[PDB]
Amino acid sequence: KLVFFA
Amino acid sequence: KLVFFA
Amino acid sequence: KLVFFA
Amino acid sequence: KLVFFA
Ligand SMILES: O=S(=O)(O)c1cc(S(=O)(=O)O)c2c(/N=N/c3ccccc3)c(O)ccc2c1
Ligand SMILES: O=S(=O)(O)c1cc(S(=O)(=O)O)c2c(/N=N/c3ccccc3)c(O)ccc2c1
Numbered sequence: 001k002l003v004f005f006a
Numbered sequence: 007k008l009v010f011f012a
Numbered sequence: 013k014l015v016f017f018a
Numbered sequence: 019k020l021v022f023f024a
Contacts, residue, residue, distance in 0.1 A: 002020065004009040011017065011020075018019040 002009065002011045004007075006007040006009075014021065014023045016019075016021040018021075
C-alpha cells in the first residue's frame, strides 16, 4: 500500500 | 499531487 | 523521468 | 516492486 502527497 | 497504489 | 511498478 | 528515477 503506497500513499504519496506532493 | 496525489498518488495511491494498493 | 521513469516510473516502473512490477 | 516500485522503481522511480528522475
Ligand atoms: O519485471 S521485469 O523482469 O520485466 C523487469 C525487472 C526489473 S528489476 O527486476 O526491477 O531490476 C527492471 C529494471 N530494474 N530497475 C531498477 C532500477 C534501479 C533499482 C532497482 C531496479 C529496469 O531498469 C528496467 C526493466 C526491468 C524489468
Ligand atoms: O518528490 S519528487 O518530485 O522527486 C517525486 C515525484 C514523483 S512523480 O513526479 O509523481 O513521478 C515520484 C513518484 N511518481 N509516482 C507516480 C506513480 C504512478 C503515477 C503517478 C506518479 C514515485 O513513485 C516516487 C517518488 C516520486 C518523487
